[PDB]
Design a protein around this ligand. Structure first.
Ligand SMILES: CC(C)=CCC/C(C)=C\CC/C(C)=C/CC/C(C)=C\CC/C(C)=C/CC/C(C)=C/CC/C(C)=C/CC/C(C)=C/CC/C(C)=C\CC1=C(C)C(=O)c2ccccc2C1=O
Ligand code: SF4
Ligand code: SF4
Ligand code: SF4
Ligand code: SF4
Ligand code: SF4
Ligand code: FES
Lengths: 125, 188, 165, 407, 183, 220
């Protein structure tokens, strides 16, 4: 019943648009409604996740001032009971760091809408 | 059954189908003979004279792009004949004297057969202290194709294609001598 | 053996010598004349841009730190002699390694490397310096780039150096 | 037993481990019982990235491994490229002389960094500052000659990127005059210091047998008394024409290696004086226009850039000159297919380069046997059994440059 | 921190300015040099220059006492976890200076082994071009970071500044969309 | 084999891997062959070194072990047959007349077009006593990348066998522990293999980006 709240972190507004487009108000009709919180700066994302109340965080590994993998590592080291983290990786060879970030899932750029949706479903289920 | 003739290019023997051009045999053997007017899919014309090679029993250098293989021919390219190398380099020089100093702005730069073949088979510096031929550039021969006649080496590949391959001879070699230039009729 | 204490003499003596530090930033030290500082896009004496947009500088860059796009010097709007000019010219100084292959590559001396070096920013994008930042300042006698070539002159004259304000 | 043994990461982030070297030390109390090396924290894929850039662009890559010996990396690369081209005999005498002079000044600079960082790791705080003062004199010279303080790409296949500036010779003479005097300050701090000797003498012992087994070279090998130097054995760049003595010692310990480096700086000063004497006006690049780097850098009010004379030649007068400039700058020379191994005596030992060309404009395969990589195999021998403090001295004596290690 | 609990006004403004002045001075770097840029940091400390003139001579060996992490080198894949660990083990406030092109963006080494910019693993406050940056460039970047620190807010001002910076950053188009004059 | 070792076949003039920017130049076929066996009178001390190697090794063993001898640019490269590598290495190191005490390392190179011999390991050996230099070249197929580890003969090959395994996957069997040294143990793939992509990212620019050099055009 609660609208799942998803944090979308990316300096690039187009990556946020793509994430918010692959995912919709409902990932599937069986899932609850989805609410998106866009954040463009790592401090703001950290503050938001400090307030809690998030079911998933999508962090762009290509974020300019503070990459998504660093933010994922930070949040998993700083927020207790933090939501599962999905990281967007700018290249295949970033996969290793995606593992190091301990993000529950990694989706390479360019963001395949279906792959992102499937990963999000797997993390929420 | 296709008839195989055999001949020696430089000092390596090779067998190729009868009717093969020396340039094609050299290609199959791995010898890089410089060429501009030759085209595998166009009927040979022997215009640019760039593909000259020395053939035993012939006073003149022979354009490998027009020479059919013979069952006992002996061919030595610029790699194994000072005469052939000198001829090819002289042809390259004569090819470059009138050429514009346009490589930085030329679209073909970096992918230009003239640049590559001048590096591989040309002299390092010019002797042409005289005045270069010049044309207005670039003139349009159609809505899509621009023509910079100064860079033209008059290899006739454009015209030979538009005549043989496509039956659309709307471009042809106009004028005569140093003024010869590919062109459309007037405005057609 | 006092030799084992020689070090004490070195430090003590150097106490009474004037410190050798250069006084940057207030009194910056002298860089070498040949130092590989910021790239700079230069102009001809009449103000036309030298960059013909050949992309040789970008071609030779080992770090892909230069992005260049050429455009025609239409008679209505000419920026450089000849039929091409560099419409878009960007150097990603977060990829530039100061190797200097670009200036060695440039066939028009349009690209030089000045001795200026101060460069830093808190934003990655701000260090992608475009044509506006790299162009040399317009000096006395130079006109705005969008103007026709010098009277009675042509590209060859510019390259041979026969052009004046 | 296990209860009495700690295992501690000397770790990448540690003052003596150059930030990217991981010494994993098993210590009983404070004696290093066992040593391992995590390497590759500074790997860069330079060897693979070379494969996607033409020749004369790989110079900028190779100069950035063993960054304390930039000119040695560049010289090894260019010697290899020329050997594949078969033009090693065509390099102008001036170019070879300048290469030798720059490699020797670079040896002085690299030894200065080694002594500075070793002294700082061992508490000799002023050692770093004096060594870097001398190094800054040398780097002023390098900046004037090449326009860069570090990672120079000045040595190019077939010669040099550009000829020396008019004032470079006078600056190098001033170095040959003042540098031994300044090095006297650093030597006084350390050479005969009781604490320095106690801290280094008898530390990190490694016999000649160990050096051979692990393939050690450079100051470590020559601290065993073996006068092996690639400049004398297998001469290159015309080193055969210089009268210099191969510095060697018989202590086999850290102090012996330190003294070898100190004396090598003086030998390098002597070699640079010889180079200055031998230096004559002339070309610095092969005359073969098909291979010679076409650029002609010159200064002006605008800055450093292609000289106006070259600009005029290629854009106004010479079509062949323009084609050659365009091609040699853009895709560069194409090296005949082949496979060569070329070695130089970098400050840390035999810097070897295995280079393979497939006939193309890019190096098919470039591999650097960086002496630091092999020397680091001596850490287990030189640290095990000694205290952690002795381990610091031994590692500093190895003088690794992790850029050359990982590459 | 009680300094954050202080209410706005002249008190908080004076605390902010005093903290900024104090922190710009004594900005101890972490002893964390990588690759060839580390040699340039050492040169910056060398006599010809003097990092000490800015109160930054003490290169805190431990991350605990370090205020500024000058990455100063190329970060390999295997090293990114170590660099992040060092950054975390420093204590607030923390600043990162991406010295050199490799640290800032991967520089010339655009390949598998390099991380393509420190910011992929830790927040970067100043990007410093150069390969390596000559010591004057390092001092310039450090002074720019000093200016940034001096203006750093605190407490309620910190929260408001974070919100305003968010509002501003949400709107900036990406660099890929700055097609000015592209054909 | 006796012919020169063809490592790649390039089709078309101007060293273009793709179809060709200009029509009609793509028909040239030139195999890129690394030099074959040198005629017997090797120059310099190479002749003496091979004479001694053939004396210490039996004629049968010498034939079985030495696949080729290449004197290129006044440098001697013994294309040694796999499996026999430890024997010839021991002979070179221990024999008083050869005495190549100093093995300088092991360099991996990949020839994806060299059928059955894709992976090559190069052992630069130096004899300080005689002041001589040679290289050993050992070829292994990509399908069976195993090679005898010279750890017993040349301990220095450790960290060189490990590095070349990391960057090429050459399995130096008999090595005390052939673990990755440069890449993380968790890494996937062997970076310096030619098939392994460069793994770069596009370089950003206002309004554009330049793909990594491996994706863009080249004329090798
Ligand atoms: C408490 C309270 C409020 C009380 C009220 C009163 C009151 C306010 C104050 C009371 C007094 C108090 C408490 C005052 C506070 C200050 C205080 C207590 C002390 C702190 C200050 C202090 C101790 C100052 C002096 C310390 C000092 C002399 C420091 C200088 C140290 C030096 C010389 C450092 C330079 C070292 C250096 C060059 C570092 C570079 C190394 C780096 C980063 C690179 C890494 C690196 C290395 C190291 C290689 O070896 C290497 C080799 C080859 C290739 C690469 C590398 C490589 O990457
Ligand atoms: S066509 Fe002429 S101007 Fe254009 S690249 Fe070729 S040689 Fe240069
Ligand atoms: S325009 Fe026609 S004749 Fe001239 S070079 Fe091109 S194809 Fe040859
Ligand atoms: S700066 Fe020079 S090399 Fe670069 S596009 Fe302009 S003219 Fe060409
Ligand atoms: S200095 Fe070197 S890396 Fe930087 S833009 Fe110029 S050519 Fe490219
Ligand atoms: S930016 Fe240049 S000097 Fe600094 S670490 Fe990278 S390659 Fe080395
Ligand atoms: S290509 Fe044969 S004469 Fe022109």
């Amino acid at each position: 019943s609660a609208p799942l709240r998803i944090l979308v972190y990316s300096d690039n507004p187009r990556t946020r648009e793509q994430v918010r487009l692959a995912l919709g108000k409902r990932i599937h009709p069986e899932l609850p409604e989805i609410e998106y919180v866009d954040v463009a700066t790592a401090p703001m994302a950290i503050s938001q996740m400090d307030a809690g109340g998030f079911d998933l965080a999508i962090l762009d590994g290509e974020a300019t001032p503070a990459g998504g993998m660093g933010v994922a590592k930070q949040v998993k080291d700083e927020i207790d009971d933090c939501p599962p983290i999905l990281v967007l990786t700018g290249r295949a060879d970033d996969a290793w760091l995606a593992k190091w970030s301990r993000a529950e899932a990694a989706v390479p750029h360019p963001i395949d809408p279906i792959r992102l949706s499937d990963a999000v479903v797997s993390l929420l289920r | 059954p296709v008839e195989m003739v055999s001949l020696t290019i430089d000092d390596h023997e090779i067998s190729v189908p009868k009717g093969t051009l020396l340039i094609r045999a050299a290609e199959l053997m791995g010898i890089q003979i410089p060429r501009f007017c030759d085209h595998p899919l166009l009927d040979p014309v022997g215009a640019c004279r760039q593909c000259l090679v020395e053939v035993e029993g012939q006073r003149k250098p022979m354009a490998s792009c027009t020479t059919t293989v013979m069952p006992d021919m002996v061919v030595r390219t610029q790699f194994t004949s000072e005469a052939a190398d000198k001829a090819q380099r002289g042809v390259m020089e004569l090819l470059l004297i009138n050429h514009p100093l346009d490589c930085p702005i030329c679209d073909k730069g970096g992918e230009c057969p003239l640049q590559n073949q001048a590096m591989s088979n040309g002299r390092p510096e010019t002797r042409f202290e005289d005045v270069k031929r010049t044309f207005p550039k670039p003139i349009s021969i159609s809505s899509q194709v621009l023509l910079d006649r100064e860079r033209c080496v008059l290899c006739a590949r454009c015209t030979r294609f538009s005549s043989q391959i496509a039956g659309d001879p709307f471009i042809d070699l106009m004028e005569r001598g140093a003024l010869q230039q590919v062109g459309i009729g007037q405005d057609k | 053996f006092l030799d084992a204490l020689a070090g004490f003499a070195v430090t003590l003596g150097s106490m009474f010598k004037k410190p050798i530090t250069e006084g940057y930033p207030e009194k910056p030290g002298p860089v070498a004349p040949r130092y590989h500082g910021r790239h700079q896009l230069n102009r001809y004496p009449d103000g036309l841009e030298k960059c013909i947009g050949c992309e040789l500088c970008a071609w030779a860059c080992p770090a892909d730190a230069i992005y260049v796009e050429g455009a025609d010097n239409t008679a209505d709007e000419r920026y450089s002699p000849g039929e091409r000019y560099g419409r878009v010219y960007q150097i990603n100084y977060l990829r530039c390694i100061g190797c200097g292959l670009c200036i060695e590559a440039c066939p028009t001396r349009a690209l030089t490397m000045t001795t200026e070096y101060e460069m830093a920013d808190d934003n990655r994008a701000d260090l992608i310096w475009g044509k506006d930042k790299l162009l040399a300042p317009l000096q006395e006698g130079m006109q705005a780039p969008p103007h026709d070539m010098a009277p009675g002159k042509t590209d060859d004259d510019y390259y041979l150096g026969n052009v004046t304000p | 037993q296990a209860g009495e043994r700690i295992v501690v990461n000397m770790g990448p982030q540690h003052p003596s481990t150059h930030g990217v070297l991981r010494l994993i030390l098993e210590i009983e109390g404070e004696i290093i019982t066992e040593a391992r090396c995590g390497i590759g924290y500074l790997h860069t894929g330079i060897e693979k990235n070379l494969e996607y850039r033409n020749w004369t662009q790989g110079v900028t890559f190779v100069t950035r491994m063993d960054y304390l010996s930039p000119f040695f990396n560049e010289t090894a690369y260019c010697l290899g490229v020329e050997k594949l081209l078969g033009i090693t005999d065509d390099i102008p005498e001036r170019a070879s002389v300048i290469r030798v002079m720059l490699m020797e000044l670079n040896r002085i600079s690299s030894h200065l960094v080694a002594l500075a960082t070793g002294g700082m790791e061992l508490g000799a705080m002023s050692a770093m500052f004096y060594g870097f003062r001398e190094r800054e004199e040398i780097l002023r010279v390098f900046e004037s000659i090449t326009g860069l303080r570090m990672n120079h790409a000045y040595i190019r296949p077939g010669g040099l990127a550009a000829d020396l500036p008019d004032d470079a010779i006078t600056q190098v003479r001033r170095l040959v005059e003042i540098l031994p005097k300044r090095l006297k300050d650093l030597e006084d701090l350390l050479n005969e210091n009781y604490i320095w000797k106690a801290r280094t003498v008898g530390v990190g012992y490694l016999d000649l047998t160990g050096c051979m087994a692990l393939g050690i070279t450079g100051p470590i090998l020559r601290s065993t008394g073996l006068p092996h130097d690639l400049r004398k054995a297998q001469p290159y760049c015309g080193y055969e024409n210089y009268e210099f003595d191969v510095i060697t010692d018989d202590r086999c310990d850290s102090y012996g290696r330190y003294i070898i480096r100190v004396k090598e700086m003086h030998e390098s000063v002597k070699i640079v004086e010889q180079c200055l004497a031998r230096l004559k006006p002339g070309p610095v690049m092969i005359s073969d226009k098909k291979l010679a780097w076409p650029a002609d850098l010159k200064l002006g009010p605008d800055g450093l850039g292609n000289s106006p004379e070259h600009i005029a030649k290629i854009m106004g007068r010479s079509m062949e000159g323009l084609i050659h400039h365009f091609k040699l700058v853009t895709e560069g020379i194409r090296v005949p297919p082949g496979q060569v191994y070329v070695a130089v005596e970098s400050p840390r030992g035999e810097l070897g380069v295995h280079m393979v060309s497939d006939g193309g404009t890019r190096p098919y395969r470039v591999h650097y046997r960086d002496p630091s990589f092999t020397n680091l195999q001596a850490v287990a021998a030189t640290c095990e059994g000694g205290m952690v403090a002795d381990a610091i001295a031994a590692v500093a004596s190895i003088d690794p440059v992790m850029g050359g290690v990982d590459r | 921190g009680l300094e954050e609990r202080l209410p706005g006004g002249i008190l908080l403004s004076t605390v902010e300015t005093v903290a900024g002045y104090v922190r710009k001075g004594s900005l101890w770097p972490a002893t964390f040099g990588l690759a060839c840029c580390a040699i340039e940091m050492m040169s910056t400390a060398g006599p010809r220059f003097d990092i000490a003139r800015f109160g930054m001579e003490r290169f805190s060996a431990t991350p605990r006492q370090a205020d500024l992490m000058i990455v100063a080198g190329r970060v390999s894949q295997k090293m990114a976890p170590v660099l992040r660990q060092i950054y975390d083990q420093m204590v607030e406030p923390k600043w990162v200076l991406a010295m050199g092109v490799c640290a800032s963006s991967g520089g010339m080494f655009n390949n598998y082994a390099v991380v393509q910019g420190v910011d992929h693993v830790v927040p970067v406050d100043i990007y410093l071009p150069g390969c390596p940056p000559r010591p004057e460039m390092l001092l310039h970047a450090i002074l720019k970071l000093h200016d940034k620190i001096q203006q750093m807010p605190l407490g309620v001002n910190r929260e408001e500044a974070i919100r305003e910076a968010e509002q501003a950053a949400l709107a900036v188009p990406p660099t890929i969309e700055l097609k000015g004059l592209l054909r | 084999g006796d012919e020169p070792e063809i490592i790649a076949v390039r089709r078309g003039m101007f060293g273009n891997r793709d179809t060709g920017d200009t029509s009609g130049y793509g028909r040239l076929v030139r195999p890129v062959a690394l030099p074959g066996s040198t005629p017997r009178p090797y120059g310099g001390y190479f002749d003496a070194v091979m004479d001694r190697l053939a004396e210490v090794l039996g004629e049968e063993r010498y034939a079985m072990s030495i696949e080729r001898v290449v004197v290129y640019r006044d440098q001697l490269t013994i294309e040694v047959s796999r499996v026999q590598l430890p024997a010839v290495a021991s002979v070179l190191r221990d024999d008083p007349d050869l005495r190549f005490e100093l093995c300088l390392g092991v360099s991996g190179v990949h020839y994806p077009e060299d059928t059955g011999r894709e992976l090559h390991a190069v052992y630069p050996l130096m004899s300080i006593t005689h002041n001589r230099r040679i290289q050993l070249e050992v070829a292994a197929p990509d399908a069976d990348p195993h090679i005898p580890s010279l750890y017993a003969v040349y301990p220095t090959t450790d960290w060189h066998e490990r590095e070349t395994y990391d960057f090429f996957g050459i399995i130096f069997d008999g090595h005390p522990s052939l673990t990755r040294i440069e890449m993380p143990d968790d890494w996937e793939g062997h970076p310096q293999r030619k098939d392994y992509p460069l793994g770069g990212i596009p370089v950003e620019y206002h309004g554009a980006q330049i793909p990594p050099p491996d994706q863009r055009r080249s004329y090798s």
